[PDB]
Design a protein around this ligand. Structure first.
Ligand code: CL
Ligand code: CL
Lengths: 166, 278
């Protein structure tokens, strides 16, 4: 079968662990696809996004330093991402590119699940190299769910991440 | 873990390709951090796709119908052999600079010499058809020590035009009718037309009536794995070859151009044949 293409856009991206967790998750769920790393120099972000649409790449995550840069090139941006003024997740719907930001929701969810608490109280270090691991995994999983419609096994993603960071 | 490099095919359509099958298996057997994908590119979306290749850092892509001519303006450089053919089927991305090549000719030739264990020295060759699928083969054959490379085509003027681009000292142009009458004058006969290809199988590129026994009859068609033409040639005592080899060597040459390593062609043929017989 023809696998769909996904990946991470950023500069640098070579040491990202997103491929590790996403690819294991695709396989686990029998999803014909692969997650890659796209090193995009500042100045070519416009061409990278136009490139995503033209090549039919299914979707891409966006890390430093393009979260803000990709916005003018999308066809639609989620009100939340607009407000934040940053996008870390893009999906290509038959040519229409929509931007989302799962960094926040991801931090929150990973917090209350890893700490087993509820923010309704006063209402951790995101650096993973509480860890930022939970955040890395959850923001990715939210993106994974947007693309595939399936919520991946986060415990497995965390396990692979941690093991690698060690 | 290492960053996988991205390769793929651009065209419209691309889903039928066997390149992923071949390349992904080769990357695995050789321990190469990479994957070959399929990228559908609509006519008029070529400039954006190429710009994408540069921006995203895609290592290389093959090009097929109907973009082999259309991609040229977006390339920084085009190999001399590809410029002569006027089509690019292989692009390598050298850290931002795109160079195009065409593996048609060498793919065919190298597969012929190896599969049939022969040298082209002094061979009298007849190429049938004068289309894009024949230009690479024709030009590469001219670079060998073949005795002659003649060309036959239904519309003789197209063959004449191509021969003028060639030598004219070792190559003459003929109509299919003329070619059939002098079919005995050739050591190797090559069909580059799609006559006999799926689904219109019960027809042949040209009559083998005057074919000599023991000569080589080469058909680049690989679907079916044996055209009516090849079957009859075998019956007439000819050594035969379908296009599987060309397809494979086209892939191997691009693969080597990209990685610097020559893949296992027998393994590639094995997978290809299985996919075709499926
Ligand atoms: Cl012409
Ligand atoms: Cl072929």
């Amino acid at each position: 079968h023809m696998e769909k293409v996904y990946g991470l856009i950023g500069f640098p991206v070579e040491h990202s662990l997103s491929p590790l967790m996403h690819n294991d998750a695709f396989a686990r769920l029998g999803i014909p696809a692969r997650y890659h790393l796209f090193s995009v120099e500042p100045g070519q972000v416009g061409a990278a996004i136009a490139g995503v649409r033209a090549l039919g790449i299914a979707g891409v995550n966006v890390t430093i330093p393009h979260k803000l840069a990709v916005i003018p090139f999308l066809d639609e941006v989620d009100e939340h991402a607009r407000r934040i003024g940053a996008v870390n997740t893009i999906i290509n719907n038959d040519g229409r590119l929509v931007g989302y930001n799962t960094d926040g929701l991801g931090y929150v969810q990973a917090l209350e699940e890893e700490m087993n608490i509820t923010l309704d109280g006063k209402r951790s270090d995101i650096i993973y190299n509480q860890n930022g691991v939970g955040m890395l995994v959850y923001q990715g999983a939210l993106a994974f769910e947007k693309w595939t419609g399936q919520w991946p096994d986060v415990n497995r993603m965390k396990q692979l991440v941690i093991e690698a960071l060690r």
